[model samples]
Target chain A: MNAVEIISRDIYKAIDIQTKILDYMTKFFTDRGFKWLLPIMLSPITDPLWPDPAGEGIRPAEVDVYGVRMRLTHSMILHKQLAIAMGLEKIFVLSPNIRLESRRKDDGRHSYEFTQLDFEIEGAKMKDVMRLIEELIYGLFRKAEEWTGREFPRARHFKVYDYKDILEEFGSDEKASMEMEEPFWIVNIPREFYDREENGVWKNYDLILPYGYGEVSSGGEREWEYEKIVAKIRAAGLKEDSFRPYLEIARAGKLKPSAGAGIGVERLVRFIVGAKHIAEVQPFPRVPGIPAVI
Target chain B: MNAVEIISRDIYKAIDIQTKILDYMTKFFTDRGFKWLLPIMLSPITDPLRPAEVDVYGVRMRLTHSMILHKQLAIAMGLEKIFVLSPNIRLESRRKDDGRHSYEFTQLDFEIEGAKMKDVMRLIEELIYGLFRKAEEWTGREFPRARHFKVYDYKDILEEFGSDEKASMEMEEPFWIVNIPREFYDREENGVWKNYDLILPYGYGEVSSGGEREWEYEKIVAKIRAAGLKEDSFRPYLEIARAGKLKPSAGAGIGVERLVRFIVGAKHIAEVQPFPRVPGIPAVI
Candidate 1:
């Protein structure tokens, strides 16, 4: 599609909300004494979201620049962890992630290209992030409402659920999220090699937006020990070669215990503007199976 | 090298400067009524910076070489004043160490609808002056002070030094090299190219490039054909131009890493980068 057809009032409104959210988030983090990092678009190493079912059928986009194989940042998860190890106590990046999902039906929530407000905190627990995000989301909702002169449906307090409890009660996380009227949390999801395992339970949580908005954020306390991380990688059937850079850091016992999550920028904006499809919010939509002219 | 060695005190200092520059630029643009666009990293039709082709789901997409084309399109879509901190990936051919080249870098790309070459130049001068002043105060580093930037004619420089490289080396302060006849989209008025490159002093070379755009349908088509660029590859943009949608605009992309290098007095541009994507050098992270 051409630029004219792709851009609309809805798109502009979404952009407005998106911009507001960014400004608010920047201030939120800066006020909390977090260092804002310039986003890294490509690197020799990036997030390998292994064993995460959402990563299934998604292929990493790579390019040979100057004879060095660099992958477009799938997510800055690894980079955030490294930044923490390098002594940045709290850091955040408005990272653009590329995930070339195999052709699928338009879900109205998926985009091959999207941005995430990825942040990490050293020496923080999963509960610490959960509380921080709750306040952050509440402030964002309030500010967005003021900007748009419209109110969003939110609960006085976001509810929390255990992963197994949701599956047992609602049959699936999708079904559970559909029944939600406000943003909530699902914890202890068994996924990803980097998530810390405590007493055989993954110490992670996902913030699910109510009304079928699905998961907007996912993270936990990270696996910092070298042996445990390597074991987890091996168990997930991932090659150590691809993770050599990160593995080297872990091997040297330099990895710090950190907690973080990536909140999707478009998904959040989509929810804020109530766009029917994720592509409607993006100026140059990079939807899977749909090619844009500009 | 691991993260320990790759990241140093110098890199952190440079990042601090980079952050200050970003905050200052954002305020500068926002105060001027320019919308801060979230960066577009990949797109179907990006800048044809002489280019790199990436295959995305059977369609040959491109990593953003620059935001020039997208910026123009944004203007076409009725956003009058816009700017994006664009992440551009230009895979320069294997070359000797230039100390300023990177395979991946960022550009503070901006466009102003209905602005001319002079308008853009004045805006940039104001931006640079303020940036230098702030950076100096923040970092305790000295910067060359100039009441006004000297503008050098492209033709005169070509005749005297044979290339911008040699002329840039002979300079001691930031100056404007005007009328570079390179890009097809650069506006040419009455036989003189209305384009310019911001050349940094102390042999740092070109840090920014932009000019007035050829917005007319016929002029753009003629320039494309004259430059021998494949019209088919630019069919979408050509269609927009042909449909009389493009607007007269002036803009430029200032290389972020190069600017940081200049501000930090870095020996090489890579020193400023945490994960340096130096041309021909493989990064460990």
Candidate 2:
């Protein structure tokens, strides 16, 4: 199918599951009493020309579709902090960016955009979610198969694998590094594993989903305690102070235990289509200098 | 109820309806043999600053308690545009630039940023649509009403009534001249109407809404045509060597018909809410 067709199909898949989730969540929101604000539009802000003093300090050729625009810096702050404030258990974000040139007439006028399907489920663990998501996938594909009058080929094409085994198979860590891109899903990991501060120590097994391309989604049981977050931030060499507002919010006892994750939509789309590469599912395929249309 | 309590209670109103709507839409997508996209987050190419922006953008900005600034702009756009090529229909906007600190939130957050508040208003239409279906109250009476608004300058108001007439309107006109700094609306309805260029010919039936948002350029207007239902004649092409149509050509930069309607059957004016703001805003889907 073409980009538009693929997008439409994906959107439909999303809407069904998402609506079910949202319906489930409405009760969650009301029970939790999240202040309901009506859906309103924000003017899409698109300014091609840079503002001024446009270097990386505050902004550097920052591409934005109006409204708010910031790069990767405080990007997750909005996510983590909001999740903290709302007392959400876990929020899942999944998708990649759409380039400007690849923008669809239906995807709005501007480009350089991304969309995610996010949700939170209480009292569900990773493996449990694996089964649930698997059922959802089955339910979705089952409907598609029923509609099309054809047996939907299951994605026996992929499976779970570990990093250590893959490295051993490849014969060397360096060799494995060259072959893989996005890595396996990491689960139940602790700071002791590959810790530079402690000098490459070790920990328990983290469930890793191996991909020929690379790791797609990274999530595990969360570390909800306040101190764990601080240690993780410092261990990663990230600015702990920048998350001050977030730290303050967390310290305020507003946040609760929760695991969160983000999955790449384009990658998942490619996997579903049984395609070897993700760009096949991208609207206007973007990678090298190839021409793409959304 | 207090604003917070009201906010707390109505939080799920749109989502309740959104679930029903999405189910219907998904079936449509499935019938077409298309794949469905989920609500993904779009951070602004620039970025967002407020947790409110993230929530307003419709993504879960808070996790147990921290705010992860997703590109709220994405959620905003997803809510506004149905699907690319679906064509944009209308925009209705309002603002209170009254310098009062109490209203500052209204000004700064709502419109003062000099952004397209009108387009933002059009979004409100999509968000509040969920409530429209419930408009029929007991006794089969409608409980939803949409009031209209337009804007004109004071010069226009003064001109219609000459100086003597204009002076008399000060005592006579029940006008609410809001946003004095901008000098925008001259609301004088049910009394003698006035404006420089055009006289308030009709004795103003509460001149729904009046304001000036000049159709500066047609960049955004072109996108409206993509909505597939054109309200303009294919006339402007000859004017710009046949490049554009006339009615919409005029509408290019101008905010048109910022009027909300009562439609002969509805309850209060507040029933109507914003559109995209309704649910997860498709989050990013």
Candidate 3:
């Protein structure tokens, strides 16, 4: 399809909102002493993304760069944790995540390629991260409203619920999100091997947007101890060889406790502009099952 | 090796300077009305840079070697001026570490519709002048400031020093070497190639390369055949040219790391890259 046909006023407005989102997020984090790490597109070891339901049918992209097989970054989870381990107190990266979702759903929310505002804070708890996200959302919405000259749906205060309780009451995060009036948190979800676990509960949280926006962010306290990390990797049936670089650091007891989350930039912009599909906000949309021309 | 081993005072300083360079670049382009497009990491059609390929879900895809094709398409599709902090993947074979070559790097790729060679050079000149001033103030470092960057004909340079590399080694300031005979897409006028390379002095070599583009269908086909490239490989691009949908544009891809390395006075390009992806070196994290 010719891009001229798709370059509408709505697309421009959505892009404007996207730009502001990036700028505001940068300001918010840097003002709080966060170092912005440039995004890495490919690496030998990226996020395994194992056990996350959203990653079903998602295959990581790989290529041989100078005889070294490298996989495109599915997420910056491992890299950000390494940065924290290397002594950065707080860090963020506007990373491009390539998740070759094979099942190919035509859902308005899914894109094979997307951007994430990935951040991590060393020595922080899940609750501290949740509070930080809450304030960020409130401030970001205010700034977006001023930029767009349109009022956004407001939340009196962000509420939290146990994942088990949500599943029992509403069956799924999607259904529960549609039942709410504002952004809220779903906590203690068991997903991914890296999330911290204590007393049989995974200390992780996902920020779900109300009115069917689903999850806009995912993060939790990281498991840093060498033994625990090894146990989780083995239990999850992942190959230790692929993660040799990171395992070496953890094995040396350099891994540190950190809390972090990745907020989807396209999803946030789509929600703000009320787009029919996530593709509307992207200049060259990488929708699942659909290939881009340019 | 532990990241802690490589995380030193100098690397951090280089990164800080890199950050400022990005900020300055964004300001330079945006203030001039260039729309900043988020980078595309993978696509079906990307810059065919002596090329590399990968498979994604049974579809043959390529990592972006550069955003040249996309930039041209964007410009043709009505973005008068556009730019992207484009990530590039060039699978260079193992060689001696020159400190300037990285398999993974970024380019500040930009394009403008209806622009000439001189027009873009003037833009680059102004951009470099202002950028150097800001960076010098930020780091208290001295850069060779010139009122105007010297321009040399490619033929003249070849005759004088036998090669561009020799010429680059002898220069003391950044200069332009124009009219190089390469690439089918670069516009050629009056039997002379109308492209240029911004050669950094003191043997740093070419930091940026661009020129006017050949938008005519027949010219593109002829050039492709002359360059001994299989036309079917570039069928998508050819179709647009054949349809006369392509526009005459001038653009360049400036190596971000190389610039940062020069400004920071780092001995190796890897020092400026946080996670050094130096050519042939095994990567850690």
Candidate 4:
């Protein structure tokens, strides 16, 4: 673990910096009086010093208020979900945030120990969140300027523009608003419409608060229909238990109608701080395949 | 699963509500500036779907994301720990907060699902989170309420407080609270705290927080010496791991949803919420 060496030698402050930047982003939700929840997770331990129910792993916190060990990750999951359906949205997740890949810290800014912003504009009007994303994108760019006291390089600085406009304007087929913004912008689909028909699947022409690396926030309207959700979950290959009781509790509440989005807080931090890395965010980045630094 | 036996038809509304809640929680965090790690785990599937990697008969989230299931029980634990540890008090958990049994809603709160070190203050802090959640579930009640508003009676009080403090104190223990605000809380010869060791070692302490020290040889030796107990190397129950590494693992994390639902003010989410629980409770609130 090259990063472990960085941590051991005390050059790995990016993790802490990433935490500060992310905390800067999450504090907005908590400040609104929204409750916070951190999903506890087990770290893989190939060492022989620890004992656990798992073949060779255990959680990090085992003290005795009551003598039993608990998983914060599992318990906090639905409680916050229930709270959100009741109308609160912010949460603090301290474990792995992505589910689509084998944990790694090498390419594309992802790793076992990386941090995510995962901000959801749940129940907020889709248009409002899109506007917020745009502003934040600019703010993020501005943050970079403030942090390093210099603008990003021409080869690196990106832009913010509708995916459609960029695609049509530049005549480029890659619909993402990548590398396109005010000083420079990009586009995806052309001749768009609000309905999905013109663009069968859309993210309100999702404007990435576009950065040098890639998009951070991935948000859109939520499916309120029961059938639609089931179809989506099945499509995603999620199981029945995936829809736990707390979900039902939240649905039964007043949040019956809504849309939401999420962003990787750490991703944006890496982008802005010009660190060009993801492991710069955690005390121990927990990347899969990396040996324990402790 | 019994509660769900009442109504199994049309769990779609349940799934929809679940998505609805997720959107809600995710947004709540985004607005507050907290990062939402889109539930590291998105799959809530069961056996035949994904076999357990660690057990032959058991099953778990195949693509677990650190518990992003977004359920009430999960939420309750985090809230509880903040309340408890956020305040620096030297206190003991009550019978309401203690125990290692697996009540459908009372005893499943485990925290150790990762690497372990000795003297896991982190684990203890995490367990406090679940207790905090239980306390939240008991929210707005005159007496600390359990699932279905169930309350612990005076008998448990006599054993704990040498009298019925929960019943008389309206669900609090100021007298016991006096045990806190201490300059220090030390471990006793019996592994009990010398100062806080008044009653049963676990009369009212928490059942578990899932964090623990790796089975270090030296530490175990020291502990054995302190307790004046003979060391036995053949205890299977004490066999920390069966296949691999040592001192780098942890015990199972507790499922606190079951416990908080029973001891604290149960939201009746399983019975009242929109998603289907794992065992599938069937109630309409």
Candidate 5:
């Protein structure tokens, strides 16, 4: 079949399933009173996670928005942080992200461009974020089975593990949950951008899925204090000015203390639909090096 | 209070009200079985709405200014009746400081298969009507005056009011300005532009604009050549069209921020957005 036929037939149902996931999520967040924020698609900067030797970020796409060069949002971490700090706490963005990073070839579990349902809560901690996500995932499984009339055999209780314990045992975050037959969580991870510092490390969590499916969600408490965030950024050899806007919000003393998590919607749907590759769940999946079939 | 505080209180309420609009619209469309599709952020080519080209891995790709083409493609992909909470970018001369013009904005873009211009217009009318009522309830605020927006034939509005701006400015309320000039040949019916522009009277200008699309192979080619645009630019679109794969479709893109501004009667659309990306103005957040 042609590309159109393939998408019309096989892809349509996957998209429907994904929307079902989104609908359930919208109801879940809105019921508990989470305001949905429209995503910012482009800016001159992105998160510093993927940086070159010169510290210039390497993003897949950049556009000239009236002579100012801006990067397509790799993720909305900075924007979400600013929103929480600016007093719009309890916000979530069902954000679409474009990552131009290198990826493993033929991995059905990865896509260059994807959507992530990221949300942040003001005056919350790692534990609170974890509790909400745990319930959210469990609720989705229960609701999906009830709504779709099909039992997702893999859907069950999420087994939990310590980040250090899992890493020490498996030697790789990629392999940490590979041995599990059920979905699990590796909590209290080493320092991430938004984690409480403990013994020079930050607290975090990675919700890893089972049946050899890897991490589906990664979130925890974030470093909210100006000095600590600055320290973390500078420690990573990134110029503190890189986050000047966010720091200004911090310096003004209005930056609220908050915690949040980002769930990779496509990956979550992939786990639900039992799709081999992440691209299978997306309507027009942009896999690295593979030209789009439109 | 600081700008942050100002935005937090007023802008948050505005955003909340807009969400109610979206929720209502989502239910409205989905009840009729509209598919929610993921947005297309990057494309090799885009509707010739803007000139700003993006550098995607050294290839000159265009950031989507409108999902009109993508929605047409989606219809071809066998998904009829779709909506996308799309993020689109355009580069225009920054000299027009009109609050309506922004380089980046979110649009509630949608399309339907086997639908014509009239069908699309009817859908927009019902949506706008539903939206006005919902906004009034959600915000507990009245719009400028009793100028409930009404639709007028393209020719009648033009002949009576001279131009779009005159008609829009003279109206006591918002007006749906339908069938203007043909930017590109889609369906040229009854001396109209085969599209519509929703103009608000309170100096908000055009809040939303869209129309039926030309999906035929020969008709599109004829229009492309007539418009003096190269066929090479729309390779994928034309290729799809040539294969007789283009579906008969009608669609439109509604500016989310502009809609909020029009409904809340905000003076500037920048007030409605969290961190407005206005041209010639720079903001950190």
Candidate 6:
């Protein structure tokens, strides 16, 4: 089949498969008393908390609406965090994020416009967050197998690695995925926006899919205290002015202690279909450098 | 409740309620073999047919004024039936204080290939009717005032209804204002382009507006030129049609927040939106 035909069929199949996965995840979260939040596509303040590793430094799509400056949200960490503090014990958004700088462009594994099933749970710890994802991904594989009638092998036990150890042993992400031979977790993620405890260790985790598909999800307990968040922002070399609005929320002392993750919807669908490129999963793929096409 | 608290509560409730309604509607369409398409939020060839412009990434990309062009293009992509929970931005002049208008809003933009205006009308009517009945049962609050819609054609109204305001005032319940004059519609020479708008009673005007589209490549090109709109604005869409890939389709764009406001009997459309971006009003959230 031609690219158009392949995309057409895959999109239909992906929608069916992804919707089922999302609905199942939604039910799982809601049954635990979570509420869904409407997506905030653009905002003045976004997830300055999580900085990209590729050193692109907060390159959000800038929009000028009648001369009012607006930034398309790269991530809504502040929104989700504030929602939890606003008396919604657990909240999630079918979030669309626009991250202009992409590291996986050459591999066709990333896009500027992407959706994340982002959820934050109040009064939850790092372990609780890890357990939720473990059960969820396990459930996803089980369901995807039934839906696609394909053999989706399950890992005997998901592996957990320290960030330093993986880098030391495998030398790179591609090497690690090649050597590991199964889907696993990497604990002790350094400075990737997971909560940093007093021991100077982060309570964050990353989930890597097997077969050379790299990290699919990462999250951890957030720094709820105003001072630490300010410190973290400064520590990341991002100006405090850009994060002033979120800091005000933290200063109000209402931000509840929470843990959450943003699971890439397209990546999940891409892995399920074993597609050669992530662009195949979305109908109108908005690649970073490619000219936009209908 | 105070306005801020009321808006917060209503927005949360609307999310829960509207999500349920959308899921039910999704099943309704998909059971009949409809596919869901993702929204194209920005592009060089956006809803220029409507004249809303917002500059992004140094490129003048309209912030999705309407889903009409996108939906028609998706039909050409061979998807027989499709729906998108589209976010639209229309720089609709700062009639700033008007309670129902916003610079940005969400719309349930849908389309079906080979269908005409009547077929789309029937689908919308049944969907709305079912939604109201189910909503009343779901909320256990008879807030919804569901009733059969009264339809009217283009010239029939000027001859009998006297004026648009008088027609709106006379409407005691939901109604469909149909068969609009071709001059106001996007395309022509096809019965599929039967323009219509759904009016919510109680003076809440135009909850949704849509119609069938012209698919003939020549007619569409001619219509573009005749409308004084540059063919350059729709280059990609025209090229697709010229390639014999553009398919015939019927489509509609329903104002989601407006629908919620009408259902809840909210005083303003902003009450149902979480972070409503109103023109001339700075962002508070």
lDDT tens digits by residue: candidate 6, A1-294: 232442245356766676566567766766676676667665666665356443355466666556656677777777777677656677777777766654445465677677788988888887888888888888778888899999785854587888788889888666787666568888766563435555778788788887887778877788878887787777777777776666776766767788888888888888888887787777777676554555
* iRMS, all models: 2.4, 13.0, 3.1, 14.5, 2.9, 4.1
Candidate 2 lDDT over residue span B130-160, tens digit each: 3334334312454334432223445544565
- Per-residue lDDT value at A193 in model 6: 45
- Where model 4 places Cα greater than 4 Å from the true spot, the runs are A2-12, A32-105, A112-115, A119-123, A135-201, A204-211, A226-255, A286-294, B1-171, B174-217, B220-285
Model-by-model lDDT, in order? 0.80, 0.29, 0.81, 0.33, 0.71, 0.70
lDDT of 4 by residue, B157-268 (tens): 4566565323333433211111111111011223322121111111233223222222344544455455554444212212322211232322222333323333332334
CAPRI category for model 5: acceptable
DockQ-based ranking? 1, 5, 3, 6, 2, 4
| Residue B58 shift from truth in candidate 1, angstroms | 1.6
Candidate 3, residue B208: the lDDT equals 90
Q: After best superposition, candidate 6 residue B42: deviation in angstroms?
A: 1.9
Query: What's the fnat for candidate 5, on a 0 to 1 scale?
Result: 0.26
How well does chain B match by TM-score in each candidate?
0.94, 0.21, 0.94, 0.29, 0.88, 0.85
Candidate 3's residue-wise lDDT over B1-285, tens digit each? 355454332456666677677777866887787766778887767665555666666667778888787787776666678887777877676684687898788888999999999999989988888888888899888887985699999989989988878998999989999999877778998998878889888988888999999889999899889877788767666777777878999989899989998898888888787687776765766
Listed in order, the DockQ scores are 0.46, 0.07, 0.37, 0.05, 0.42, 0.30
Recovered native contacts, candidate 2: 0.03
Q: What 10-residue stretch in candidate 4 chain B is worst by lDDT?
A: B80-89
Model 5 misplaced regions, further than 4 Å: A1-9, A50-60, A103-106, A153-157, A291-294, B1-10, B143-149, B189-192
Question: Scored by Cα lDDT, where does model 6 land?
Answer: 0.70
- Tens-place lDDT digits, model 4, residues A152-246: 43323334455545555654322243444333332222211111112344443333433335455444444444454444445534443434442
Tens-digit lDDT track of model 5 for A1-294: 235543454667776777678777877887788888888887655666433221134533665555556777777887787777656768888798877644443456666677888999988887788889878888888877876678653443566777667657897656765667666777765543546676755566778777677878877777767777777777766676556556766666666677888898889888777788777776676776554544
- The C-alpha RMSD of each candidate to the native structure, in angstroms, is 2.2, 14.4, 2.6, 13.5, 3.3, 3.5
Q: What is the TM-score of each candidate against the true structure?
A: 0.94, 0.43, 0.92, 0.47, 0.91, 0.89
TM-score ranking, high to low: 1, 3, 5, 6, 4, 2
Clashing pairs in 6: none
lDDT of 5 by residue, B56-175 (tens): 545566667677777887788777788888988766556855777776788888888888776776777777777777677777876543324577877887799887768777876777
Q: What residue runs in model 3 are displaced by over 4 Å at the alpha carbon?
A: A1-10, B1-10
